Amino acid sequence: QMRLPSADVYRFAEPDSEENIIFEGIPIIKAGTVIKLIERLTYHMYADPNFVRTFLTTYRSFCKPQELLSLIIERFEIPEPEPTEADRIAIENGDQPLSAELKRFRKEYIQPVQLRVLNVCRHWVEHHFYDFERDAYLLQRMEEFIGTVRGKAMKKWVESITKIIQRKKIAFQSSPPTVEWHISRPGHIETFDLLTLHPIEIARQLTLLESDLYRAVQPSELVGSVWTKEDKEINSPNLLKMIRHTTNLTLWFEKCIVETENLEERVAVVSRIIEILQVFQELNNFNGVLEVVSAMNSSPVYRLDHTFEQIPSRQKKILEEAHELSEDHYKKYLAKLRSINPPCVPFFGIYLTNILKTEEGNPEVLKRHGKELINFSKRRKVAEITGEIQQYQNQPYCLRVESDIKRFFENLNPMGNSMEKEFTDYLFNKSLEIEPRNPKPLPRFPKKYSYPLKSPGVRPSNP
């Protein structure tokens, strides 16, 4: 083969050994030092698409962005062998032509490695620009590096990378159905509520909202269970925003239910929420369907036997059928998802559960002769889970946004100023009040709504 740089001048020349890289054409990396991982992330022998994508999605769980950039730049700066004093003089004179060995080295090692590095930089800014958005110094270094790279073969890469960075920094194929209105009138946000807005529109606007929340979540926000750790707000902003939306919506449904003390009005409320679930299902917004199921199964709501006994049989069946989605480890849901095409808002809860388990259930590193190697197979397993999330992030819903309804829901704050525990306890105590435990009979309560409770139904007013 050909002689690579000396270890005392280039760190990525160290031959592979059982102590620096472990494998599972193109072998699969199981573990290794950051150095070897980076070496293979830009291997000169061949391209490694799957490793590049997996590495860029999960590296933060084992290497800082600043250090990664330093490492790939260090990788890029390949030194050439130093000449002797005899060779130096031989060059001043016209003694010999350019070393065929050096020519080969430049062509077979340096150029290919350098191109691999630029390919990583390209994928980095294209799929994970948020690293540079969150760290200005990082963006400066990258731009400085790319901005000084010079070479005929690399010009095209510099151009491409530069274009992506620029556009990142600055930053209906069909007629949608007519917006539906019920009691509340357009523009009159003061009357907006669960029973006053049209159930169809509540479902549509929530689907649009949830679709956007979903599409913004990046896989790296789940890697290393970072959304549950100290720097969660920085590493998982999009994921938290969606989780919080879900918590708030579920709590809002529960709230609407238990605060409606009159039995007939509460039955009306539950029935309307189920109608909303019907439209969520209609739009393939499983996230929404399950938020409803979650509310119905909550401590304060599930125990309201007199309320569920009073809802229409047809809706009891509709709720039962949807409830089956989560049953037995989401067996029915997972099967249903496999044959679904977008637009769709998948249930996210499952991804979080699986990752938490995979993250806790696997070792951060792998011991070899006492040396800690990064367990890359673990990262590949997590990437397998997150890779599924991106499936429905590219197709928008053909539904028109209603800015006022959208705002109403973006601002939902069921808990008011009270805290989590305090509110959850309040809801359960409200449940016990409207439907007391066994011995005590069901007390009657006065109506709280002054408008009709009759639902307009979930069939769009197309005519």
mmCIF file with all atom_site columns, all heavy atoms in Angstrom, residues 128-149:
data_model
loop_
_atom_site.group_PDB
_atom_site.id
_atom_site.type_symbol
_atom_site.label_atom_id
_atom_site.label_alt_id
_atom_site.label_comp_id
_atom_site.label_asym_id
_atom_site.label_entity_id
_atom_site.label_seq_id
_atom_site.pdbx_PDB_ins_code
_atom_site.Cartn_x
_atom_site.Cartn_y
_atom_site.Cartn_z
_atom_site.occupancy
_atom_site.B_iso_or_equiv
_atom_site.pdbx_formal_charge
_atom_site.auth_seq_id
_atom_site.auth_comp_id
_atom_site.auth_asym_id
_atom_site.auth_atom_id
_atom_site.pdbx_PDB_model_num
ATOM 1   N N   . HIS A 1 128 ? -28.077 19.577 10.118 1.00 0.00 ? 128 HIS A N   1
ATOM 2   C CA  . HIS A 1 128 ? -27.989 19.937 11.537 1.00 0.00 ? 128 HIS A CA  1
ATOM 3   C C   . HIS A 1 128 ? -27.513 21.369 11.761 1.00 0.00 ? 128 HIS A C   1
ATOM 4   O O   . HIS A 1 128 ? -26.690 21.628 12.642 1.00 0.00 ? 128 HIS A O   1
ATOM 5   C CB  . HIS A 1 128 ? -27.037 18.966 12.246 1.00 0.00 ? 128 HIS A CB  1
ATOM 6   C CG  . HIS A 1 128 ? -27.348 17.524 11.989 1.00 0.00 ? 128 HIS A CG  1
ATOM 7   N ND1 . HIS A 1 128 ? -28.306 16.832 12.700 1.00 0.00 ? 128 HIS A ND1 1
ATOM 8   C CD2 . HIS A 1 128 ? -26.883 16.669 11.049 1.00 0.00 ? 128 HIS A CD2 1
ATOM 9   C CE1 . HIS A 1 128 ? -28.419 15.612 12.205 1.00 0.00 ? 128 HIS A CE1 1
ATOM 10  N NE2 . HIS A 1 128 ? -27.569 15.487 11.202 1.00 0.00 ? 128 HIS A NE2 1
ATOM 11  N N   . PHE A 1 129 ? -28.046 22.304 10.980 1.00 0.00 ? 129 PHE A N   1
ATOM 12  C CA  . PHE A 1 129 ? -27.625 23.683 11.107 1.00 0.00 ? 129 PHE A CA  1
ATOM 13  C C   . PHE A 1 129 ? -27.877 24.255 12.494 1.00 0.00 ? 129 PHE A C   1
ATOM 14  O O   . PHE A 1 129 ? -27.237 25.237 12.894 1.00 0.00 ? 129 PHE A O   1
ATOM 15  C CB  . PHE A 1 129 ? -28.309 24.566 10.064 1.00 0.00 ? 129 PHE A CB  1
ATOM 16  C CG  . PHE A 1 129 ? -27.666 25.917 9.924  1.00 0.00 ? 129 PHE A CG  1
ATOM 17  C CD1 . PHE A 1 129 ? -26.380 26.032 9.413  1.00 0.00 ? 129 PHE A CD1 1
ATOM 18  C CD2 . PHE A 1 129 ? -28.313 27.066 10.372 1.00 0.00 ? 129 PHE A CD2 1
ATOM 19  C CE1 . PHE A 1 129 ? -25.742 27.269 9.352  1.00 0.00 ? 129 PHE A CE1 1
ATOM 20  C CE2 . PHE A 1 129 ? -27.680 28.310 10.316 1.00 0.00 ? 129 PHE A CE2 1
ATOM 21  C CZ  . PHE A 1 129 ? -26.393 28.409 9.806  1.00 0.00 ? 129 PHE A CZ  1
ATOM 22  N N   . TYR A 1 130 ? -28.804 23.649 13.230 1.00 0.00 ? 130 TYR A N   1
ATOM 23  C CA  . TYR A 1 130 ? -29.112 24.127 14.573 1.00 0.00 ? 130 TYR A CA  1
ATOM 24  C C   . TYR A 1 130 ? -27.890 24.168 15.490 1.00 0.00 ? 130 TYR A C   1
ATOM 25  O O   . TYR A 1 130 ? -27.879 24.932 16.457 1.00 0.00 ? 130 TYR A O   1
ATOM 26  C CB  . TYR A 1 130 ? -30.237 23.293 15.208 1.00 0.00 ? 130 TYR A CB  1
ATOM 27  C CG  . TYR A 1 130 ? -29.990 21.807 15.186 1.00 0.00 ? 130 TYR A CG  1
ATOM 28  C CD1 . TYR A 1 130 ? -29.087 21.213 16.064 1.00 0.00 ? 130 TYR A CD1 1
ATOM 29  C CD2 . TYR A 1 130 ? -30.646 20.994 14.265 1.00 0.00 ? 130 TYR A CD2 1
ATOM 30  C CE1 . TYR A 1 130 ? -28.845 19.839 16.021 1.00 0.00 ? 130 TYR A CE1 1
ATOM 31  C CE2 . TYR A 1 130 ? -30.414 19.628 14.215 1.00 0.00 ? 130 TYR A CE2 1
ATOM 32  C CZ  . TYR A 1 130 ? -29.515 19.059 15.091 1.00 0.00 ? 130 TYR A CZ  1
ATOM 33  O OH  . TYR A 1 130 ? -29.275 17.713 15.018 1.00 0.00 ? 130 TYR A OH  1
ATOM 34  N N   . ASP A 1 131 ? -26.867 23.357 15.208 1.00 0.00 ? 131 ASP A N   1
ATOM 35  C CA  . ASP A 1 131 ? -25.646 23.388 16.026 1.00 0.00 ? 131 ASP A CA  1
ATOM 36  C C   . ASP A 1 131 ? -24.961 24.756 15.880 1.00 0.00 ? 131 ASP A C   1
ATOM 37  O O   . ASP A 1 131 ? -24.398 25.287 16.837 1.00 0.00 ? 131 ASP A O   1
ATOM 38  C CB  . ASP A 1 131 ? -24.631 22.316 15.593 1.00 0.00 ? 131 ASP A CB  1
ATOM 39  C CG  . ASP A 1 131 ? -24.969 20.922 16.106 1.00 0.00 ? 131 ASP A CG  1
ATOM 40  O OD1 . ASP A 1 131 ? -25.657 20.791 17.146 1.00 0.00 ? 131 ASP A OD1 1
ATOM 41  O OD2 . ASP A 1 131 ? -24.516 19.951 15.462 1.00 0.00 ? 131 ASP A OD2 1
ATOM 42  N N   . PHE A 1 132 ? -25.001 25.306 14.669 1.00 0.00 ? 132 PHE A N   1
ATOM 43  C CA  . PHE A 1 132 ? -24.380 26.598 14.380 1.00 0.00 ? 132 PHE A CA  1
ATOM 44  C C   . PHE A 1 132 ? -25.287 27.747 14.789 1.00 0.00 ? 132 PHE A C   1
ATOM 45  O O   . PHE A 1 132 ? -24.813 28.835 15.095 1.00 0.00 ? 132 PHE A O   1
ATOM 46  C CB  . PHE A 1 132 ? -24.036 26.684 12.886 1.00 0.00 ? 132 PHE A CB  1
ATOM 47  C CG  . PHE A 1 132 ? -23.169 25.561 12.422 1.00 0.00 ? 132 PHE A CG  1
ATOM 48  C CD1 . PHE A 1 132 ? -23.726 24.449 11.791 1.00 0.00 ? 132 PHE A CD1 1
ATOM 49  C CD2 . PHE A 1 132 ? -21.809 25.560 12.702 1.00 0.00 ? 132 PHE A CD2 1
ATOM 50  C CE1 . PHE A 1 132 ? -22.945 23.354 11.456 1.00 0.00 ? 132 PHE A CE1 1
ATOM 51  C CE2 . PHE A 1 132 ? -21.010 24.461 12.369 1.00 0.00 ? 132 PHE A CE2 1
ATOM 52  C CZ  . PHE A 1 132 ? -21.581 23.355 11.745 1.00 0.00 ? 132 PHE A CZ  1
ATOM 53  N N   . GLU A 1 133 ? -26.591 27.503 14.789 1.00 0.00 ? 133 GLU A N   1
ATOM 54  C CA  . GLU A 1 133 ? -27.552 28.522 15.193 1.00 0.00 ? 133 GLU A CA  1
ATOM 55  C C   . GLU A 1 133 ? -27.451 28.749 16.699 1.00 0.00 ? 133 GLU A C   1
ATOM 56  O O   . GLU A 1 133 ? -27.656 29.861 17.184 1.00 0.00 ? 133 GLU A O   1
ATOM 57  C CB  . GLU A 1 133 ? -28.987 28.086 14.850 1.00 0.00 ? 133 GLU A CB  1
ATOM 58  C CG  . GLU A 1 133 ? -29.405 28.309 13.400 1.00 0.00 ? 133 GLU A CG  1
ATOM 59  C CD  . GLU A 1 133 ? -30.824 27.823 13.117 1.00 0.00 ? 133 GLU A CD  1
ATOM 60  O OE1 . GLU A 1 133 ? -31.364 27.050 13.940 1.00 0.00 ? 133 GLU A OE1 1
ATOM 61  O OE2 . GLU A 1 133 ? -31.396 28.205 12.069 1.00 0.00 ? 133 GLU A OE2 1
ATOM 62  N N   . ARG A 1 134 ? -27.130 27.681 17.427 1.00 0.00 ? 134 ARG A N   1
ATOM 63  C CA  . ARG A 1 134 ? -27.024 27.724 18.880 1.00 0.00 ? 134 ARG A CA  1
ATOM 64  C C   . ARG A 1 134 ? -25.659 28.169 19.399 1.00 0.00 ? 134 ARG A C   1
ATOM 65  O O   . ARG A 1 134 ? -25.530 28.545 20.565 1.00 0.00 ? 134 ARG A O   1
ATOM 66  C CB  . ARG A 1 134 ? -27.354 26.350 19.464 1.00 0.00 ? 134 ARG A CB  1
ATOM 67  C CG  . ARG A 1 134 ? -28.787 25.881 19.230 1.00 0.00 ? 134 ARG A CG  1
ATOM 68  C CD  . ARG A 1 134 ? -28.910 24.407 19.613 1.00 0.00 ? 134 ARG A CD  1
ATOM 69  N NE  . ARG A 1 134 ? -30.199 23.821 19.254 1.00 0.00 ? 134 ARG A NE  1
ATOM 70  C CZ  . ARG A 1 134 ? -30.449 22.514 19.288 1.00 0.00 ? 134 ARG A CZ  1
ATOM 71  N NH1 . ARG A 1 134 ? -29.499 21.659 19.662 1.00 0.00 ? 134 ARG A NH1 1
ATOM 72  N NH2 . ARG A 1 134 ? -31.643 22.058 18.944 1.00 0.00 ? 134 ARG A NH2 1
ATOM 73  N N   . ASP A 1 135 ? -24.647 28.131 18.535 1.00 0.00 ? 135 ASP A N   1
ATOM 74  C CA  . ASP A 1 135 ? -23.296 28.518 18.921 1.00 0.00 ? 135 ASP A CA  1
ATOM 75  C C   . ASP A 1 135 ? -22.662 29.364 17.813 1.00 0.00 ? 135 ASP A C   1
ATOM 76  O O   . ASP A 1 135 ? -22.197 28.833 16.796 1.00 0.00 ? 135 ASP A O   1
ATOM 77  C CB  . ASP A 1 135 ? -22.454 27.257 19.183 1.00 0.00 ? 135 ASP A CB  1
ATOM 78  C CG  . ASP A 1 135 ? -21.037 27.578 19.622 1.00 0.00 ? 135 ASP A CG  1
ATOM 79  O OD1 . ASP A 1 135 ? -20.594 28.728 19.402 1.00 0.00 ? 135 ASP A OD1 1
ATOM 80  O OD2 . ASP A 1 135 ? -20.363 26.678 20.169 1.00 0.00 ? 135 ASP A OD2 1
ATOM 81  N N   . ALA A 1 136 ? -22.647 30.680 18.024 1.00 0.00 ? 136 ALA A N   1
ATOM 82  C CA  . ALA A 1 136 ? -22.097 31.627 17.059 1.00 0.00 ? 136 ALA A CA  1
ATOM 83  C C   . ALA A 1 136 ? -20.611 31.418 16.767 1.00 0.00 ? 136 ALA A C   1
ATOM 84  O O   . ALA A 1 136 ? -20.177 31.542 15.622 1.00 0.00 ? 136 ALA A O   1
ATOM 85  C CB  . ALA A 1 136 ? -22.344 33.055 17.540 1.00 0.00 ? 136 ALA A CB  1
ATOM 86  N N   . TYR A 1 137 ? -19.830 31.097 17.791 1.00 0.00 ? 137 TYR A N   1
ATOM 87  C CA  . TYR A 1 137 ? -18.405 30.865 17.586 1.00 0.00 ? 137 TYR A CA  1
ATOM 88  C C   . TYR A 1 137 ? -18.202 29.682 16.628 1.00 0.00 ? 137 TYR A C   1
ATOM 89  O O   . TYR A 1 137 ? -17.302 29.697 15.789 1.00 0.00 ? 137 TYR A O   1
ATOM 90  C CB  . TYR A 1 137 ? -17.717 30.591 18.929 1.00 0.00 ? 137 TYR A CB  1
ATOM 91  C CG  . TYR A 1 137 ? -16.222 30.334 18.856 1.00 0.00 ? 137 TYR A CG  1
ATOM 92  C CD1 . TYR A 1 137 ? -15.392 31.095 18.027 1.00 0.00 ? 137 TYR A CD1 1
ATOM 93  C CD2 . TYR A 1 137 ? -15.629 29.366 19.673 1.00 0.00 ? 137 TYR A CD2 1
ATOM 94  C CE1 . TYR A 1 137 ? -14.008 30.902 18.016 1.00 0.00 ? 137 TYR A CE1 1
ATOM 95  C CE2 . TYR A 1 137 ? -14.248 29.164 19.673 1.00 0.00 ? 137 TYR A CE2 1
ATOM 96  C CZ  . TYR A 1 137 ? -13.441 29.936 18.845 1.00 0.00 ? 137 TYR A CZ  1
ATOM 97  O OH  . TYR A 1 137 ? -12.070 29.758 18.879 1.00 0.00 ? 137 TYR A OH  1
ATOM 98  N N   . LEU A 1 138 ? -19.052 28.668 16.761 1.00 0.00 ? 138 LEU A N   1
ATOM 99  C CA  . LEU A 1 138 ? -18.975 27.472 15.922 1.00 0.00 ? 138 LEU A CA  1
ATOM 100 C C   . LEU A 1 138 ? -19.197 27.870 14.466 1.00 0.00 ? 138 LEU A C   1
ATOM 101 O O   . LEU A 1 138 ? -18.449 27.476 13.586 1.00 0.00 ? 138 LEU A O   1
ATOM 102 C CB  . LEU A 1 138 ? -20.043 26.453 16.342 1.00 0.00 ? 138 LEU A CB  1
ATOM 103 C CG  . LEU A 1 138 ? -19.955 25.092 15.633 1.00 0.00 ? 138 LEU A CG  1
ATOM 104 C CD1 . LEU A 1 138 ? -18.757 24.317 16.177 1.00 0.00 ? 138 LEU A CD1 1
ATOM 105 C CD2 . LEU A 1 138 ? -21.236 24.298 15.850 1.00 0.00 ? 138 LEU A CD2 1
ATOM 106 N N   . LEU A 1 139 ? -20.237 28.655 14.230 1.00 0.00 ? 139 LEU A N   1
ATOM 107 C CA  . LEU A 1 139 ? -20.554 29.124 12.887 1.00 0.00 ? 139 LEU A CA  1
ATOM 108 C C   . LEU A 1 139 ? -19.389 29.943 12.322 1.00 0.00 ? 139 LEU A C   1
ATOM 109 O O   . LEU A 1 139 ? -19.054 29.816 11.144 1.00 0.00 ? 139 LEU A O   1
ATOM 110 C CB  . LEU A 1 139 ? -21.837 29.966 12.917 1.00 0.00 ? 139 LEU A CB  1
ATOM 111 C CG  . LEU A 1 139 ? -22.361 30.572 11.605 1.00 0.00 ? 139 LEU A CG  1
ATOM 112 C CD1 . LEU A 1 139 ? -22.476 29.509 10.515 1.00 0.00 ? 139 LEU A CD1 1
ATOM 113 C CD2 . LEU A 1 139 ? -23.723 31.215 11.876 1.00 0.00 ? 139 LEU A CD2 1
ATOM 114 N N   . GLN A 1 140 ? -18.768 30.773 13.161 1.00 0.00 ? 140 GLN A N   1
ATOM 115 C CA  . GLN A 1 140 ? -17.632 31.578 12.716 1.00 0.00 ? 140 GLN A CA  1
ATOM 116 C C   . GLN A 1 140 ? -16.513 30.663 12.254 1.00 0.00 ? 140 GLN A C   1
ATOM 117 O O   . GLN A 1 140 ? -15.987 30.817 11.147 1.00 0.00 ? 140 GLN A O   1
ATOM 118 C CB  . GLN A 1 140 ? -17.085 32.476 13.838 1.00 0.00 ? 140 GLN A CB  1
ATOM 119 C CG  . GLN A 1 140 ? -15.998 33.453 13.338 1.00 0.00 ? 140 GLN A CG  1
ATOM 120 C CD  . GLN A 1 140 ? -15.200 34.109 14.461 1.00 0.00 ? 140 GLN A CD  1
ATOM 121 O OE1 . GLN A 1 140 ? -15.622 34.116 15.616 1.00 0.00 ? 140 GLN A OE1 1
ATOM 122 N NE2 . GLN A 1 140 ? -14.043 34.671 14.118 1.00 0.00 ? 140 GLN A NE2 1
ATOM 123 N N   . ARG A 1 141 ? -16.140 29.714 13.109 1.00 0.00 ? 141 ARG A N   1
ATOM 124 C CA  . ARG A 1 141 ? -15.067 28.785 12.767 1.00 0.00 ? 141 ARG A CA  1
ATOM 125 C C   . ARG A 1 141 ? -15.354 28.034 11.457 1.00 0.00 ? 141 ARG A C   1
ATOM 126 O O   . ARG A 1 141 ? -14.479 27.920 10.601 1.00 0.00 ? 141 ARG A O   1
ATOM 127 C CB  . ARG A 1 141 ? -14.852 27.767 13.893 1.00 0.00 ? 141 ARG A CB  1
ATOM 128 C CG  . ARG A 1 141 ? -14.216 28.320 15.172 1.00 0.00 ? 141 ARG A CG  1
ATOM 129 C CD  . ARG A 1 141 ? -14.020 27.196 16.187 1.00 0.00 ? 141 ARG A CD  1
ATOM 130 N NE  . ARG A 1 141 ? -13.037 26.215 15.733 1.00 0.00 ? 141 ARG A NE  1
ATOM 131 C CZ  . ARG A 1 141 ? -12.951 24.970 16.189 1.00 0.00 ? 141 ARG A CZ  1
ATOM 132 N NH1 . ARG A 1 141 ? -13.795 24.544 17.121 1.00 0.00 ? 141 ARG A NH1 1
ATOM 133 N NH2 . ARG A 1 141 ? -12.022 24.151 15.712 1.00 0.00 ? 141 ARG A NH2 1
ATOM 134 N N   . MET A 1 142 ? -16.574 27.524 11.307 1.00 0.00 ? 142 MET A N   1
ATOM 135 C CA  . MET A 1 142 ? -16.928 26.781 10.094 1.00 0.00 ? 142 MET A CA  1
ATOM 136 C C   . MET A 1 142 ? -16.792 27.668 8.864  1.00 0.00 ? 142 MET A C   1
ATOM 137 O O   . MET A 1 142 ? -16.126 27.301 7.894  1.00 0.00 ? 142 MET A O   1
ATOM 138 C CB  . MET A 1 142 ? -18.359 26.235 10.187 1.00 0.00 ? 142 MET A CB  1
ATOM 139 C CG  . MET A 1 142 ? -18.832 25.518 8.912  1.00 0.00 ? 142 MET A CG  1
ATOM 140 S SD  . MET A 1 142 ? -17.870 24.030 8.574  1.00 0.00 ? 142 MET A SD  1
ATOM 141 C CE  . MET A 1 142 ? -18.766 22.852 9.598  1.00 0.00 ? 142 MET A CE  1
ATOM 142 N N   . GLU A 1 143 ? -17.416 28.839 8.911  1.00 0.00 ? 143 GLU A N   1
ATOM 143 C CA  . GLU A 1 143 ? -17.343 29.762 7.787  1.00 0.00 ? 143 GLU A CA  1
ATOM 144 C C   . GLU A 1 143 ? -15.892 30.127 7.492  1.00 0.00 ? 143 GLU A C   1
ATOM 145 O O   . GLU A 1 143 ? -15.497 30.199 6.331  1.00 0.00 ? 143 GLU A O   1
ATOM 146 C CB  . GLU A 1 143 ? -18.179 31.019 8.062  1.00 0.00 ? 143 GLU A CB  1
ATOM 147 C CG  . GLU A 1 143 ? -19.670 30.772 7.948  1.00 0.00 ? 143 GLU A CG  1
ATOM 148 C CD  . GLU A 1 143 ? -20.476 32.054 7.854  1.00 0.00 ? 143 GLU A CD  1
ATOM 149 O OE1 . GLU A 1 143 ? -20.579 32.605 6.740  1.00 0.00 ? 143 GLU A OE1 1
ATOM 150 O OE2 . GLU A 1 143 ? -21.004 32.520 8.885  1.00 0.00 ? 143 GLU A OE2 1
ATOM 151 N N   . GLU A 1 144 ? -15.094 30.333 8.541  1.00 0.00 ? 144 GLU A N   1
ATOM 152 C CA  . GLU A 1 144 ? -13.679 30.665 8.363  1.00 0.00 ? 144 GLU A CA  1
ATOM 153 C C   . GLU A 1 144 ? -12.939 29.532 7.678  1.00 0.00 ? 144 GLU A C   1
ATOM 154 O O   . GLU A 1 144 ? -12.112 29.759 6.793  1.00 0.00 ? 144 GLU A O   1
ATOM 155 C CB  . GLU A 1 144 ? -12.985 30.911 9.703  1.00 0.00 ? 144 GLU A CB  1
ATOM 156 C CG  . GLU A 1 144 ? -13.141 32.295 10.278 1.00 0.00 ? 144 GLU A CG  1
ATOM 157 C CD  . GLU A 1 144 ? -12.135 32.544 11.389 1.00 0.00 ? 144 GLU A CD  1
ATOM 158 O OE1 . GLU A 1 144 ? -10.915 32.490 11.103 1.00 0.00 ? 144 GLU A OE1 1
ATOM 159 O OE2 . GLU A 1 144 ? -12.561 32.783 12.540 1.00 0.00 ? 144 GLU A OE2 1
ATOM 160 N N   . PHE A 1 145 ? -13.217 28.311 8.124  1.00 0.00 ? 145 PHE A N   1
ATOM 161 C CA  . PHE A 1 145 ? -12.574 27.136 7.561  1.00 0.00 ? 145 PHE A CA  1
ATOM 162 C C   . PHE A 1 145 ? -12.952 26.953 6.088  1.00 0.00 ? 145 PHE A C   1
ATOM 163 O O   . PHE A 1 145 ? -12.081 26.881 5.224  1.00 0.00 ? 145 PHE A O   1
ATOM 164 C CB  . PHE A 1 145 ? -12.963 25.888 8.363  1.00 0.00 ? 145 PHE A CB  1
ATOM 165 C CG  . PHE A 1 145 ? -12.506 24.602 7.736  1.00 0.00 ? 145 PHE A CG  1
ATOM 166 C CD1 . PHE A 1 145 ? -11.151 24.347 7.546  1.00 0.00 ? 145 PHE A CD1 1
ATOM 167 C CD2 . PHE A 1 145 ? -13.436 23.647 7.316  1.00 0.00 ? 145 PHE A CD2 1
ATOM 168 C CE1 . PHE A 1 145 ? -10.725 23.162 6.945  1.00 0.00 ? 145 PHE A CE1 1
ATOM 169 C CE2 . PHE A 1 145 ? -13.015 22.458 6.714  1.00 0.00 ? 145 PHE A CE2 1
ATOM 170 C CZ  . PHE A 1 145 ? -11.659 22.218 6.529  1.00 0.00 ? 145 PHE A CZ  1
ATOM 171 N N   . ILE A 1 146 ? -14.252 26.878 5.816  1.00 0.00 ? 146 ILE A N   1
ATOM 172 C CA  . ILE A 1 146 ? -14.746 26.703 4.449  1.00 0.00 ? 146 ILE A CA  1
ATOM 173 C C   . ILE A 1 146 ? -14.279 27.865 3.572  1.00 0.00 ? 146 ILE A C   1
ATOM 174 O O   . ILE A 1 146 ? -13.889 27.673 2.421  1.00 0.00 ? 146 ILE A O   1
ATOM 175 C CB  . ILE A 1 146 ? -16.294 26.634 4.429  1.00 0.00 ? 146 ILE A CB  1
ATOM 176 C CG1 . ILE A 1 146 ? -16.766 25.420 5.231  1.00 0.00 ? 146 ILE A CG1 1
ATOM 177 C CG2 . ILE A 1 146 ? -16.810 26.532 2.990  1.00 0.00 ? 146 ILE A CG2 1
ATOM 178 C CD1 . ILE A 1 146 ? -16.305 24.091 4.652  1.00 0.00 ? 146 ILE A CD1 1
ATOM 179 N N   . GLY A 1 147 ? -14.304 29.063 4.143  1.00 0.00 ? 147 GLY A N   1
ATOM 180 C CA  . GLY A 1 147 ? -13.894 30.255 3.426  1.00 0.00 ? 147 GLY A CA  1
ATOM 181 C C   . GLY A 1 147 ? -12.425 30.331 3.055  1.00 0.00 ? 147 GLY A C   1
ATOM 182 O O   . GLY A 1 147 ? -12.035 31.205 2.284  1.00 0.00 ? 147 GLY A O   1
ATOM 183 N N   . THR A 1 148 ? -11.594 29.439 3.587  1.00 0.00 ? 148 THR A N   1
ATOM 184 C CA  . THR A 1 148 ? -10.181 29.484 3.239  1.00 0.00 ? 148 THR A CA  1
ATOM 185 C C   . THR A 1 148 ? -9.703  28.251 2.477  1.00 0.00 ? 148 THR A C   1
ATOM 186 O O   . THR A 1 148 ? -8.556  28.204 2.034  1.00 0.00 ? 148 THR A O   1
ATOM 187 C CB  . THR A 1 148 ? -9.280  29.692 4.487  1.00 0.00 ? 148 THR A CB  1
ATOM 188 O OG1 . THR A 1 148 ? -9.484  28.624 5.419  1.00 0.00 ? 148 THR A OG1 1
ATOM 189 C CG2 . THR A 1 148 ? -9.610  31.025 5.164  1.00 0.00 ? 148 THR A CG2 1
ATOM 190 N N   . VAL A 1 149 ? -10.584 27.269 2.309  1.00 0.00 ? 149 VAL A N   1
ATOM 191 C CA  . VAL A 1 149 ? -10.233 26.051 1.588  1.00 0.00 ? 149 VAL A CA  1
ATOM 192 C C   . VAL A 1 149 ? -9.983  26.397 0.127  1.00 0.00 ? 149 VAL A C   1
ATOM 193 O O   . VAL A 1 149 ? -10.789 27.083 -0.510 1.00 0.00 ? 149 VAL A O   1
ATOM 194 C CB  . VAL A 1 149 ? -11.357 24.990 1.686  1.00 0.00 ? 149 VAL A CB  1
ATOM 195 C CG1 . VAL A 1 149 ? -11.130 23.886 0.664  1.00 0.00 ? 149 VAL A CG1 1
ATOM 196 C CG2 . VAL A 1 149 ? -11.369 24.387 3.084  1.00 0.00 ? 149 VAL A CG2 1
#
